[PDB]
Design a protein around this ligand. Structure first.
Ligand code: SF4
Ligand SMILES: [Zn+2]
Ligand SMILES: [Zn+2]
Ligand SMILES: [Zn+2]
Lengths: 280, 320, 675
DNA sequence: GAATTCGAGCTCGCAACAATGAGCACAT
DNA sequence: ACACTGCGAGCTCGAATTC
């Protein structure tokens, strides 16, 4: 159904992140919903990635490198609550850092940047309008979530590169905007299945209980039940025609010709996702 | 037609006026005299009588004979009213058309889910010494300026300022409005303040995340512009007005939001605060009882010692 | 789209019209059938232009004998070209809907420097220079030897025009200024004399104000054009300032010393008539004698003409034909250019204005230089007071004349100043899908200090800080462009250079760049092109300017340029100038206008013009603060018009500086979201 | 039945009001 | 031959209860 994704998350670190109108720290309410966002992203998208960049004082510093590590992100967002966040941000320096790595990904994916942006001013030493011709050439998809106002760049950066621009009503709207950024838009990788506890077959390296890639030999290690939930969307079961003694619960299929009741009929298509007669 | 604007009220299509302007039984001004001579001779259609429950008064029901209308719609929120004159309203206007199910609008999301809680406070042993000794209206101050009720107001304000909740402290008996709102350093719409600073204290409450509480006094008993409160610590209102505690509830639903009702127990306010829930339990609302709050003694609450409590009784009893 | 107003079939060039825009065509048809005037206030610039043109152009089809020609006086040449492009869009819609062609031509008129083909004369920059070098080739004595057709200088296009351009007119096809030059190019004709010839046979004619209200122009070009026409004065706020400056001349020491050189050159040419040079030498040494005094200011509008007959003995019967014979003397002298005699024509125009026009005029001789005790710089102003002395031809000659703008602030002032009686005098308000504007009056400061820009409340630093604390706290919550109109240039200098010595201008440059709009046009266009660049990339800018300036009237701030417009005080004129102190003494006796009700009327039409520049379009939104305490008064906020007054509530009426931010911060967040 | 407490709106007297800056389009 | 707009007095009600 969906495709692979390499999402970057640009987090604003300006003077305006000390603002109110949110949970105690405007910065803190951003990092609170981002930890919720990393969990739901990696759950619905199994083999994708997340980078997190934080822009501060006319410069961009990479908080976490681009890797599919659903633990290293949340353990780094907990550290960044005590950030200083002084100075005016940048947007040329942050989208270029998100372009030196995201350009060299293979073309079968959906490379994306997501900017969470509270300041109004991007003091950056060059012209932004040549990036939007470069990012459109490299098939990146930059989408901005704005705070408290609408900036002209963030409209023309979104609608030319291909993303969306959205401004916050409140915190119930800010969770609604981040929830819409987990569904993937409609190749052959080589991952290593990590049987035996959690060890790597290619380099035989033992490490932690994780769906993460292997550092010693560079292989990605996924768990096959986590891949298994994405099945049954492709070739799902066709419904039955319905016109006592049952076959499911023992108290009509067009394939195996075994009747069902009503509780069983709703249960087969909702949770079981297979016909109990057809497995025989 | 409210004596300040008068946007050429002769010859219009929609006139938005008040009661006690159309029924003002004294010598009117000259601008209002030429409008009332125009308004007494034109057959209207759909008079809209907002706040219907004040129409069966003696002066507000003479409006319906001054103005000639074909049909008369009446919009209200709290149809209950003392002195038994709501059955009298069935011929001034007509039959009651539609009453909204107050629990069906809560289960569908059109109204905030209110958690009513009648937290009652015990009486101080120095204040109950003088409560049972007198009967002639001086004990209304005693069950209002209770020091153990002062702690439960200061605790519930602190407990919801830490959750970023918009607090409204409705409090009648305006002597205890001052002595509550200056010992916590909070603004108060005293009622004879002005038209000026009434409008900016109310606006510093909505669009400012620093000013969080406000101490109204008998002003918000109508459909005013009180800006979407989240809690409502009602303290010592009028006697048995079940119209009032369905208009104090109107601020809250404009758990999600929840309003309290401070009662000094073992006094006359205990019998009053069950007369005023008599309308709200007939709509589906459930009034809990909070006998002891969630850790009231641990914070820095006022009136700790008995020396500072002896001075408050000498301030109350000196009024007489 | 067949749209039916009360009796007419209006062919509208769009699909959805606004519910107020139908009433604008309804109230304008109420003028034309009654054959009377009208003062209509209508907010937008476009939409108003296409609904006024949809009605009148469709009115002359059903009643082609009551109206014949629509005259459309716009402000200047950009809006002259804009109206014509709104007329092709209406004509080509009629070309598609009916499938035919029409005997319908529409023109556009401007100066000779906007309609010019001849290469040796077209790059001349100043407008008075191109009028001379054209006259050096098109004068009737230059063409006197061109009956021989020699190799002596001339205009190639002008001699090719009158031999072929009178027999055939322009057929159809609404012409811009560039279309008239292109038609003049490929045919070889002059564009300027083709437009002025074909202006008598047209149906829509779009020129500026000065062909119609300027008395020494309108008798030459708009004399015998139409007796049953329709005049529309579009964007007509400053009709009063146009009819005054058209009949007011200014004389100083620099002008009169150049007239002695003109009489010197006229003395060398007569020897190579003589009573007229001694006439002018008599008149020139009297006005120099009158400027020779160093005394109090004095006024004498017909008594100047009595003392002119005492020391000089020159009466008003030869003085009335002073400017006529000087126009005749240069014709018989066969001079090359006439821009060199521009001081002497200004003295000849001054001599024919004192003789004839003295009812509501004055002569204000000011030896006292402004703001300085004793500096030798005298000047006499011949100032007109009555703004209705230049429309008395226009209110009389034409059938119906409509005065339309967006910010006619009280509608009952314009028929009091201008002596006429309208038949509708209506106002309108634009419909909106949101609250497209959030006007507020940020009054007292953050520490409850008054903020107003009086004359005594300007030096103290309790107000200069409260202006700096406002522009700082609005530059952090407003995206992409803030326009800050000050009251003057010496108040913009004395505040910005007093924000810099404190720690306030350091903190504004962190948020937005700031681009001061200066007086000279070279730095201003640099600072304006970088302003529109800074609003488009990330940073955003602040264009802090002057309310009686060039940017306040010309440049239109469309969306995301100037989301906020900050008025740093009520933009009053200098209320102690001796010209204004004499006009208000004429507005008190005549018309019984109070002296204070005109200074506020003049200020609330320049504070509502530049604030109304922030919103032009459907989806345009825009903040507009009014940062003065005096705006909250009833005789000031009741002036500013009904489309920016119906959103100014009582809560946004004495907001402090910090409370005005949270109205703005909530407003821009609400507007940023889709429909 | 006749007060009170505290709110309301409507009239209407009362005291005193204010107003500081700078330049190009258009005719022979 | 002085004087605009806010702003507190009386005046008369209503709601619910004491007296
Ligand atoms: S006569 Fe024609 S070509 Fe010559 S200067 Fe005038 S407009 Fe230009
Ligand atoms: Zn490995
Ligand atoms: Zn089956
Ligand atoms: Zn079954």
């Amino acid at each position: 159904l969906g495709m692979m994704r390499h999402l970057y998350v640009v987090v604003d670190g300006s003077r305006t992140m000390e603002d109110q109108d949110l949970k105690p720290n405007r910065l803190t309410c951003t990092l609170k919903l981002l930890e919720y966002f990393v969990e739901e992203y990696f759950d619905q998208n199994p083999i994708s990635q997340i980078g997190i960049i934080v822009t501060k004082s006319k410069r961009a510093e990479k908080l976490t490198e681009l890797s599919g590590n659903p633990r290293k992100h949340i353990t780094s967002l907990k550290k960044a609550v005590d950030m200083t966040c002084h100075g005016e941000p940048s947007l040329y320096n942050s989208l270029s850092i998100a372009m030196q790595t995201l350009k060299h990904m293979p073309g079968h994916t959906s490379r994306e940047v997501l900017i969470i942006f509270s300041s109004l001013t991007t003091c950056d030493p060059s012209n932004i309008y040549d990036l939007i011709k470069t990012l459109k050439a490299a098939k990146i998809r930059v989408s901005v979530i704005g705070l408290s106002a609408e900036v002209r760049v963030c409209t023309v950066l979104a609608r030319e590169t291909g993303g969306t621009y959205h401004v916050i009503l409140d915190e119930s709207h800010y969770k609604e905007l981040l929830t819409h950024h987990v569904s993937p838009p409609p190749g052959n990788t080589e991952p290593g299945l990590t049987l035996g506890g959690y060890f790597c077959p290619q380099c035989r390296a033992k490490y932690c209980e994780l769906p993460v890639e292997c550092k010693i030999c560079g292989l990605t290690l996924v768990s096959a039940p986590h891949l298994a939930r994405s099945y049954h969307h492709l070739f799902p079961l066709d419904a039955f025609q319905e016109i006592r003694f049952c076959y499911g619960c023992q108290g009509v299929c067009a394939v195996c010709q075994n009747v069902f009741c009503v509780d069983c009929d709703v249960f087969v298509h909702d949770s079981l996702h297979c016909c109990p007669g057809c497995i025989h | 037609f409210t004596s300040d604007a008068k946007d050429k009220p002769i010859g219009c299509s929609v006139a938005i006026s008040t009661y006690s302007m159309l029924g003002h039984t004294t010598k009117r001004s000259w601008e209002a005299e030429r409008v009332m001579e125009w308004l007494k001779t034109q057959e209207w259609g759909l008079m809209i009588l907002d706040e219907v429950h004040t129409i069966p008064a003696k002066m507000f029901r003479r409006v319906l004979t001054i103005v000639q209308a074909h049909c008369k719609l009446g919009l209200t929120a709290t149809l209950v009213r003392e002195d038994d004159k709501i059955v009298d309203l069935n011929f001034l206007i007509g039959p009651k058309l539609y009453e909204a199910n107050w629990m069906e609008l809560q289960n569908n999301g059109y109204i905030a889910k209110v958690q009513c809680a009648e937290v009652w406070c015990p009486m101080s042993p120095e204040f109950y010494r003088e409560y049972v000794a007198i009967k002639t209206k001086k004990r209304i101050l005693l069950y209002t300026m209770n020091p153990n009720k002062f702690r439960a107001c200061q605790f519930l304000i602190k407990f919801h300022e830490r959750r970023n909740d918009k607090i409204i402290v409705f409090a009648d008996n305006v002597f205890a409005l001052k002595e509550y709102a200056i010992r916590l350093n909070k603004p108060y719409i005293y009622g004879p303040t002005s038209q000026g600073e009434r409008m900016q204290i109310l606006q510093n409450f909505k669009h400012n995340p620093k000013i969080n509480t406000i101490f109204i006094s008998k002003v918000g008993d109508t459909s005013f512009d009180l800006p979407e409160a989240n809690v409502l610590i009602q303290i010592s209102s009028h006697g048995g007005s079940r119209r009032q505690e369905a208009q104090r509830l109107g601020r809250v639903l404009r758990y999600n939001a929840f309003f309290y009702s401070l009662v000094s127990q073992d006094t006359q306010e205990m019998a009053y605060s069950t007369k005023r829930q008599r309308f709200l339990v007939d709509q589906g609302y459930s009034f809990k009882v909070i006998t002891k709050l969630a850790g009231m003694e641990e914070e820095d609450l006022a009136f700790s010692t008995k020396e500072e409590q002896q001075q408050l009784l000498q301030k109350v009893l000196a009024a007489t | 789209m067949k749209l039916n107003v009360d009796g007419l079939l209006v062919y509208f060039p769009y699909d959805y019209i606004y519910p107020e825009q139908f009433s604008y065509m309804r109230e304008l048809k109420r003028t034309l059938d009654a054959k009377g005037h009208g003062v209509l206030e209508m907010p937008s610039g476009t939409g108003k232009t296409v609904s006024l043109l949809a009605l009148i152009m469709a009115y002359q089809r059903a009643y082609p004998l009551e109206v014949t020609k629509l005259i459309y006086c716009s402000r200047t040449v950009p809006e002259i070209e804009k109206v014509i492009e709104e007329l092709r869009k209406l004509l080509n819609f009629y070309e598609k809907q009916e499938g035919e062609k029409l005997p319908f031509l529409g023109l556009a008129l401007s100066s000779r420097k906007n309609l010019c083909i001849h290469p040796e004369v077209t790059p001349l920059r100043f407008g008075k220079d191109v009028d001379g070098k054209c006259h050096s080739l098109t004068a009737s004595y230059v063409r006197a030897q061109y009956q021989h057709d020699t190799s002596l200088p001339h205009c190639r296009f002008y001699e090719e025009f009158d031999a072929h351009g009178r027999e055939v007119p322009l057929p159809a096809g609404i012409y811009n200024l560039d279309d008239l030059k292109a038609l003049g190019r490929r045919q070889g004709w002059c564009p300027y004399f083709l437009a002025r010839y074909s202006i008598l046979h047209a149906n829509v004619v779009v020129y500026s104000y000065h062909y119609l209200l300027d008395p020494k122009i309108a008798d030459l070009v708009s004399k015998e054009l139409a007796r049953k026409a329709v005049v529309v004065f579009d964007e007509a706020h400053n009709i009063d300032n146009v009819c005054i400056d058209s009949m007011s001349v200014n004389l100083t020491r620099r002008t009169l010393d150049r007239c002695q050189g003109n009489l010197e050159t006229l003395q060398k040419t007569v020897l190579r008539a003589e009573h007229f040079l001694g006439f002018l030498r008599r008149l020139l040494e009297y006005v120099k004698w009158r400027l020779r005094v160093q005394h109090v200011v004095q006024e004498s509008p017909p008594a100047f003409l009595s003392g002119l007959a005492q020391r000089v003995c020159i009466q008003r019967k030869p003085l009335r034909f002073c400017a006529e014979r000087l126009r005749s003397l240069l014709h018989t002298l066969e001079i090359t250019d006439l821009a060199d005699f521009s001081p002497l024509t200004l003295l000849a125009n001054f001599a024919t204005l004192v003789s004839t026009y003295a009812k509501g005029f004055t002569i204000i001789i000011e030896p006292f230089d402004d703001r300085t005790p004793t500096i030798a710089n005298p000047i006499l102003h011949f100032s007109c007071m009555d703004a209705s002395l230049a429309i008395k031809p226009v209110f009389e000659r034409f059938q119906s004349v409509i005065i339309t703008s967006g910010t006619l602030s009280p509608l009952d002032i314009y028929p009091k100043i201008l002596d006429f009686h309208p038949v509708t005098m209506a106002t309108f308000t634009m419909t909106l899908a949101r609250v497209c504007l959030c006007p507020m009056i940020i009054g007292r400061g953050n520490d409850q200090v008054a903020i107003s820009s009086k004359f005594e409340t300007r030096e103290d630093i309790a107000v200069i800080r409260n202006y700096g604390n406002l522009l700082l706290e609005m530059s952090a919550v407003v995206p992409d462009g803030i326009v800050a109109f000050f009251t003057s240039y010496q108040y913009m200098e004395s505040t910005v250079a007093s924000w810099y010595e404190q720690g306030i201008l350091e903190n504004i440059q962190r948020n937005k760049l700031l681009f001061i709009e200066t007086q000279d046009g070279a730095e201003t266009s640099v600072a304006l092109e970088k302003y529109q660049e800074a609003c488009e990339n990330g940073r955003g800018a602040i264009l802090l300017s002057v309310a009686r300036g060039k940017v306040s009237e010309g440049i239109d701030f469309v969306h995301h340029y100037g989301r906020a417009v900050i008025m740093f005080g009520v933009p009053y004129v200098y209320t102690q100038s001796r010209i204004l102190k004499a006009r208000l003494e004429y507005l008190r006796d005549q018309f019984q206008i109070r002296e204070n009700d005109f200074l506020t009327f003049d200020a609330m039409r320049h504070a509502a013009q530049c604030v109304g520049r922030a919103i032009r379009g459907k989806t345009d939104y825009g903040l507009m603060v009014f940062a003065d305490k005096r705006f909250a008064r009833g005789d000031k906020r009741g002036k500013l018009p009904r489309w920016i007054q119906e959103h100014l509530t009582d809560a946004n009426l004495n907001l402090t500086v910090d409370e005005g931010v949270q109205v703005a911060k909530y407003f821009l967040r609400q507007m940023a979201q889709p429909f």
